Amino acid sequence: ELRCQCIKTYSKPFHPKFIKELRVIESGPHCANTEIIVKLSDGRELCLDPKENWVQRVVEKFLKRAENS
């Protein structure tokens, strides 16, 4: 069981295209709260907090449209 990889998420907002890899983690017994995860192209790793409207909007601005997943 892998608990939330980020005890403290990103509260400050930031532009999404900088993120080179935006992958979110689902919730379960390991962690009831959902946790987002991104990897800035500069070589940084910051988990986002879905409590804000910018983190959920940033995820849609990056994962917008539906392809096949």
Swiss-Prot record:
Superkingdom of this entry's organism? Eukaryota
Record-given protein name: IL-8(9-77)
Q: What is the effect of changing residue 64 to A?
A: Impairs heparin-binding activity and leukocyte transendothelial migration
Originating species: Homo sapiens (Human)
Cysteine disulfide links:
4-31, 6-47
The stretch of the full-length protein covered here is: 31 to 99 of 99
